Amino acid sequence: QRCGEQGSGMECPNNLCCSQYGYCGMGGDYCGKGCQNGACWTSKRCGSQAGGKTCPNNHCCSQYGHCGFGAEYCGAGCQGGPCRADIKCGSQAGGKLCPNNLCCSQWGYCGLGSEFCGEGCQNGACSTDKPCGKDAGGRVCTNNYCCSKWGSCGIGPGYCGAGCQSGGCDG
Amino acid sequence: QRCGEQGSGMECPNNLCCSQYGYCGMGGDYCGKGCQNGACWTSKRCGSQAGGKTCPNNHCCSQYGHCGFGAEYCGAGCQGGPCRADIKCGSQAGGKLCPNNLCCSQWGYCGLGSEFCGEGCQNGACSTDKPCGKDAGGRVCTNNYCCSKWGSCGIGPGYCGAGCQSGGCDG
Numbered sequence A, B: 001q002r003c004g005e006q007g008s009g010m011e012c013p014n015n016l017c018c019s020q021y022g023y024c025g026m027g028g029d030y031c032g033k034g035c036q037n038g039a040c041w042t043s044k045r046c047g048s049q050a051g052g053k054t055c056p057n058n059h060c061c062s063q064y065g066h067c068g069f070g071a072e073y074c075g076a077g078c079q080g081g082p083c084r085a086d087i088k089c090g091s092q093a094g095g096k097l098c099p100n101n102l103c104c105s106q107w108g109y110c111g112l113g114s115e116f117c118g119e120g121c122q123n124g125a126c127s128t129d130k131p132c133g134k135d136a137g138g139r140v141c142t143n144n145y146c147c148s149k150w151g152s153c154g155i156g157p158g159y160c161g162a163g164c165q166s167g168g169c170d171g
């Protein structure tokens, strides 16, 4: 229910602004001074100009590094987010990973959904669920995901904690 | 710090999935069945195929009524989300509002950022707080937002509750 620093990076639906006090709504109250994410009145900084401050809410990052949507944003120079250009990745990149847990298709391109996350997926939120660990040649996960005690990649206590074989374990 | 139903329609950062228990992670335990938003293994339907629904986390809704990212979702047919084609709106498009609280620029195109939200903005999260209520001719906000006591539009208990001049006022 809470957002931003107060809600654990949590985001408001439909681009509602996360006021400085971790709540959701529209208006100067939530969108003005303070705003942590959502349709903030002052567009955030990102990537090049911000060292990789990727845009939250799956917003596009412009060539100047401000978060938003629109041709100006998602169009050319788009440094991140749902850009209109095709974002490559994978073996064909020298092994490169998609941003914001995006799946890298067999074809070497970022996206979300069956075609991207399904069979052949190279990194990101791949739904193939390939097992890792001791019982799998010692396969490690991509994106530094936690290889759970049951040889499964994920992120969370169930994965990163008790018996986390590899990745971002909590021990 | 709860998502989905367990957290007031909240979404997780970086495309992490919201399990059936209201928590954020990556893995069949967050992304598998139960997943409420985020990079769900079984994409959420949307658009005409799904009664006009919008995609969580600002995902494109492909022409087939499935949410995701990449050419197939954001390219052609894209019935919603950060569509690759400039979304049209306003006095130009028959008063058509931008979906997911996007700002309809004066040039009739949905986006987020100074260019769309700033001066001219026709609807959505416009950073211009044009006065509403008796405070200024009895003006009414766009998107069914609540005009508060002060004569300023927005969403929250502070705009929709006590002294809300018009809009989706609570009371």
Ligand SMILES: CC(=O)N[C@@H]1[C@@H](O)[C@H](O[C@@H]2O[C@H](CO)[C@@H](O)[C@H](O)[C@H]2NC(C)=O)[C@@H](CO)O[C@H]1O
Binding pocket: A043, A062, A063, A064, A065, A066, A067, A068, A072, A073, B113, B114, B115
């Ligand atoms: C110093 C300056 O204003 N440089 C301009 C860029 O910042 C500007 O990008 C836009 O900057 C605005 C801040 O003044 C942002 O609100 C806005 O979101 C951002 N727009 C984009 C698409 O990144 C560019 C382009 O208008 O011009 C420079 O001169």
Ligand SMILES: CC(=O)N[C@@H]1[C@@H](O)[C@H](O[C@@H]2O[C@H](CO)[C@@H](O)[C@H](O)[C@H]2NC(C)=O)[C@@H](CO)O[C@H]1O
Binding pocket: A113, A114, A115, B043, B062, B063, B064, B065, B066, B067, B068, B072, B073
């Ligand atoms: C009516 C129908 O079945 N049309 C087919 C589409 O469903 C199908 O699109 C893909 O469907 C998959 C599940 O059946 C989804 O995983 C996938 O996201 C979806 N693709 C898009 C872009 O939404 C396509 C094949 O991709 O064929 C149609 O005939």
